[PDB]
Design a protein around this nucleic acid. Structure first.
Ligand SMILES: O=C1Nc2ccc(Cl)cc2[C@@](C#CC2CC2)(C(F)(F)F)O1
Ligand SMILES: [Ca+2]
Ligand SMILES: [Ca+2]
Lengths: 404, 544
DNA sequence: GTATGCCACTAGTTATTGTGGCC
RNA sequence: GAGGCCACAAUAACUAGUGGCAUA
């Protein structure tokens, strides 16, 4: 078996990411996993002359609490991006988002057979740390294509089409998409004979349930009141005035006109005819599909999340602020747990629709997220994330989305 | 045979070519004496014209900062060091200092030529004696990482046959610990010495081995306990900036085992630019703090090691003005370690929030030192915590803690209304400032026809919006509706601050506890919203 | 009038000084 | 050849993003 030469962009250095400290139960699990991977030739111990490093974690994965190892190849993936997108880019099927049911399968073990270019192995270095820095740190590097590196499916992609090409002739109205270590299978067939059709594929490759059209953007709905008070108008005006950055046709001019002079907040205010009309067009703008937003493939996707309270979270996927390609609500345990499942939901939905993962903006302190995110992580990829405040009007606006 | 480790220079760089300055005769006679012996033991070799490099002769024989800058990086070892509270109790402990550490590891052959150096001639009429290293040089960037790596391979077979014996490598030292009775421990120590000797590594014999306690990294390590080396914090009638820096260093060093240390008041005295000689007058609340610190440090303390079969308990206490201390223990009154947590300072933060960050810091430290998170005991009721975190935009998570009734508790001094108060007077507040003159005004107008404006000097837009809320509270009754366009001013009030550095916000918190019902609302500025418009015209008169 | 500062939240970076070590 | 190296801390500097405001 012959290796594809790989290379960093010619001004780049290798990953030198510091290892976040691990619990004893996960250091032990990693030591066990890595001696078995080394015993099978997949990784090799390295000396101190290798200066690179990439973080490593342990997650409970495959619905069973047998530990899995997750290497965080985010920095390496950025440093090899022209390799795995421009040169050997997997194409994304626009039809996949339209199948009535899509299941996801782990194709992770397939990389283990394929070797990895000699001159690239040093950049896959990682370090099992030790409690209280009491022992120096166990260093390895990959000899075979690593799960979690984006160049892995890029290299294995030519071999992957030959495993599935016989399947494609059989079921020509089934769509297969590969994103990193995952296979997304698209079918319009009934849910009962979907599982039989997705097993036979699973059985087929060993010899070597998403509903995307259920996803749908809900519209904003405004208060409906028999009586309006000064306070109700002021709250509504502040929201609609902010929301005009999203819907430029929204107007508050006839609502502000009702607030003449220095009124007590509880005073009742009869909506004049001009007010009733402005409110009624405002509603229709919000009930209509938002318009003027279109996906730009040269831009990063961004996912923002607001803690709504009582186990409820709102989220938006966009590229330019206020131009939402998608919005939605994730419902039900603790904040970190819920936030981890929201991030995973939004990322696979993002993989299905565009073939890319969004960069997340999370409403949590970094150090708390860095302590607990592997506690519930089940995915083989790790999105990019950063940590943000949530302005009050944002939370107040997306709290108005209609529920299923 | 210890195998060499391949070492390269940084991409694009050649080796050092620095000039050797002339030296005194009494210095050159000593150098040729040191160097001829190092040649006889094979650590260096005479070189000649074939070598174009040089590094000036100098602890260290040779000064390698140029070579070190051109040497490749290493993913380097002893990033952190153990903290003593993470070690386990032992019956017997030994420390072996490896004598000929670097002299016993051969340097990668093709790298040797870059370590060249010259002993110069006396009158410089002659050229000098030129040498290069065959072994790891003292002071070369790679020697620690390469020695450590070699020592780890040498210790693998011995570690494997002796699972019960813990060996920690630290620079040239081996710290060897066991639960064996002293005699059988000494049998193991000497087996370890023989193992090391096969590779040429020499260590002190039993007669020459130090006895506990061991001085290590400023700690004093016993088999069953640890302490810091004793702190001495001086007594001066005039304190200089450099002196105050020295005190905060000693105090922050002491705070890992001495509980309740506090530095926030001596830290304020180091703010601003000031020469290191400037005699700084101690503020008396700093003098008070320096006093209680001298009290803490007069008692003796020690920490205990970690029993991995008990839970760790962490307990936090509020110390006032954004300061917090904590204690980690597994058996009551037997601390593994203590520490402190201090807020940003300039900012005013809610006490539930400050407490949650203390927990966050302690949780991270605890995973580093023991590989598991503790059980917390916190001076906060489980429903005080619940009402605050369910009403806050940010997520957090403390897996397990419980209320412990040690005052000062943390509590929410006031509770704002969710709905406007019927029959209470509605105030519209506003402020205005000019940046050039730093002059401003703050005021309100009221649905019942009342209004006020006050003029402020040396102020900001942000201060005047708070002053305006200050006035509406000052001049209303126990129930009031207040309307502002400052999401800043409003956010300070909703995120109920602890007592802070600003007297304005402290007055406001005081005013708000005394109230009976308070509803606060935000409206956007410059929209023709009544009330807000009227008060804006008032307050902006002398200012725009 | 877009351009700024003002500070609350979020995230940092390079320098000095100090404590405790090391070379 | 004017000391570097590690952890922690303090200080200063450069801060940047989000938000509402405040003057032009
Ligand atoms: O785990 C333990 N327990 C322990 C107790 C007392 C002593 Cl004095 C020493 C130790 C030890 C160590 C060490 C380095 C911190 C110097 C030893 F390696 F065992 F020596 O580590
Ligand atoms: Ca204002
Ligand atoms: Ca105003």
């Amino acid at each position: 078996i012959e290796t594809v030469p790989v290379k960093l962009k010619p001004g780049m250095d290798g990953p030198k990411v510091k290892q976040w400290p691990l619990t004893e139960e996960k250091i032990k699990a990693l030591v066990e996993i890595c001696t078995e991977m080394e015993k099978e030739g997949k990784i090799s111990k390295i000396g101190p002359e290798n200066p690179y490093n990439t973080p490593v974690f342990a997650i409970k994965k495959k619905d069973g609490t047998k530990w899995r190892k997750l290497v965080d190849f985010r920095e390496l993936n950025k440093k090899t991006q022209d390799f795995w997108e421009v040169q050997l880019g997997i194409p994304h099927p626009a039809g996949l988002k339209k199948k009535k049911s899509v299941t996801v399968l782990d194709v992770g073990d397939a990389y283990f057979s394929v070797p990895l270019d000699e001159d690239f192995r040093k950049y896959t270095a990682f370090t099992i740390p030790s409690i209280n820095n009491e022992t120096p740190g166990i260093r390895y590097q990959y000899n075979v294509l690593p799960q979690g590196w984006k160049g892995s499916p890029a290299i294995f992609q030519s071999s992957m089409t030959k495993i599935l090409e016989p399947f494609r002739k059989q079921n020509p109205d089934i769509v297969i998409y590969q994103y990193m270590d995952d296979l997304y299978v698209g079918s319009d067939l009934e849910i009962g004979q979907h599982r039989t059709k997705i097993e036979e594929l699973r059985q087929h490759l060993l010899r070597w349930e998403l509903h995307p059209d259920k996803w749908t953007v809900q519209p904003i709905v405004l208060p409906e009141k028999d009586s309006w008070t000064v306070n109700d108008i002021q709250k509504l005006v502040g929201k609609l005035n902010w929301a005009s950055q999203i819907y430029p046709g929204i107007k508050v001019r006839q609502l502000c006109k009702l607030l003449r002079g220095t009124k007590a907040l509880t005073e009742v205010i009869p909506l004049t005819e001009e007010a009733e009309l402005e409110l009624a067009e405002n509603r229709e703008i919000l009930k209509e599909p938002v318009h003027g937003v279109y996906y730009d493939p040269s831009k990063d996707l961004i996912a923002e999340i607001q803690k709504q309270g009582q186990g409820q979270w709102t989220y938006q996927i966009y590229q330019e602020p206020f131009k939402n390609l998608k919005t939605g609500k994730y419902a039900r345990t603790n904040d970190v747990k819920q936030l981890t499942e929201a991030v995973q939901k939004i990322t696979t939905e993002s993989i299905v629709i565009w073939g890319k993962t969004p960069k997340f903006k999370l409403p949590i302190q970094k150090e708390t997220w860095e302590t607990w995110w592997t506690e519930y992580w089940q995915a083989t990829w790790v999105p990019e994330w950063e940590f943000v405040n949530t302005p009050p009007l944002v939370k107040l606006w997306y709290q108005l989305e209609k529920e299923p | 045979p210890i195998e060499t480790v391949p070492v390269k220079l940084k991409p694009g760089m050649d080796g050092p070519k620095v000039k050797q300055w002339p030296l005194t005769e009494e210095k050159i006679k000593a150098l040729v004496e040191i160097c001829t012996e190092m040649e006889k033991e094979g650590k260096i070799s005479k070189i000649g014209p074939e070598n174009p490099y040089n590094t000036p002769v100098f602890r260290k024989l040779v000064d390698f900062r140029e070579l070190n800058k051109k040497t490749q990086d290493f993913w380097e070892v002893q990033l952190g060091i153990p903290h003593p509270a993470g070690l386990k109790k032992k019956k017997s402990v030994t420390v072996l200092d490896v004598g000929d550490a670097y002299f016993s590891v051969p340097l990668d052959e093709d790298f040797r030529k870059y370590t060249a150096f010259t002993i110069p001639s006396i009158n410089n009429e002659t050229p000098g004696i030129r040498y290069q290293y065959n072994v790891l040089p003292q002071g070369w960037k790679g020697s620690p990482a390469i020695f450590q790596s070699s020592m780890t391979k040498i210790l693998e077979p011995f570690r494997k046959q002796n699972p019960d014996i813990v060996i920690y490598q630290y620079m040239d030292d081996l710290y060897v610990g066991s639960d064996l009775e002293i005699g059988q421990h000494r049998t193991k120590i000497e087996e370890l010495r023989q193992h090391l000797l096969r590779w040429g590594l020499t260590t002190p014999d039993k007669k020459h081995q130090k006895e506990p306690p061991f001085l290590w990294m400023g700690y004093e390590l016993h088999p069953d306990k640890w302490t810091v080396q004793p702190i001495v914090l001086p007594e001066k009638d005039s304190w200089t900036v450099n002196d105050i820096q020295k005190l905060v260093g000693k105090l922050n060093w002491a705070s890992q085992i001495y509980p309740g240390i506090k530095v926030r008041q001596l830290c304020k005295l180091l703010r601003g630019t000031k020469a290191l000689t400037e005699v700084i007058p101690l503020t008396e609340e700093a003098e008070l703090e320096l006093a209680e610190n001298r009290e803490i440090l007069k008692e003796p303390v020690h920490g205990v090691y970690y029993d991995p079969s008990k839970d760790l308990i962490a307990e936090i206490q509020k110390q006032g003005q954004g300061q917090w201390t904590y204690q980690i223990y597994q058996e009551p009154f037997k601390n593994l370690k203590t520490g402190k947590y201090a807020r940003m300072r300039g900012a005013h933060t809610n006490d539930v929030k400050q407490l949650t960050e203390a927990v966050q810091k302690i949780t991270t430290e605890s995973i580093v030192i023991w590989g598991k998170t503790p059980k917390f005991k916190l001076p906060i009721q489980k429903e005080t915590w619940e009402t605050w975190w369910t009403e806050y935009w940010q997520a957090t998570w403390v897996p397990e803690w419980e209320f412990v009734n040690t005052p000062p508790l943390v509590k929410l001094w006031y509770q704002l209304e969710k709905e406007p108060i019927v029959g209470a007077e509605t105030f519209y507040v506003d402020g205005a400032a000019s940046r050039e003159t730093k002059l401003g005004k703050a005021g309100y107008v009221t649905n019942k026809g009342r209004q006020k404006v006050v003029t402020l000097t040396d102020t900001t837009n942000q201060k005047t919006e708070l002053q305006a809320i200050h006035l509406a509270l000052q001049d209303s009754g126990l129930e009031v509706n207040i309307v502002t366009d400052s999401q800043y001013a409003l956010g300070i009030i909703q995120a109920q601050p602890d007592q802070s550095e600003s007297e304005l916000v402290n007055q406001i918190i005081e005013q708000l506890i005394k109230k009976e019902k308070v509803y606060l609302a935000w409206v956007p500025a410059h929209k023709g919203i009544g009330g807000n418009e009227q008060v804006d015209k008032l307050v902006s008169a002398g200012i725009r």
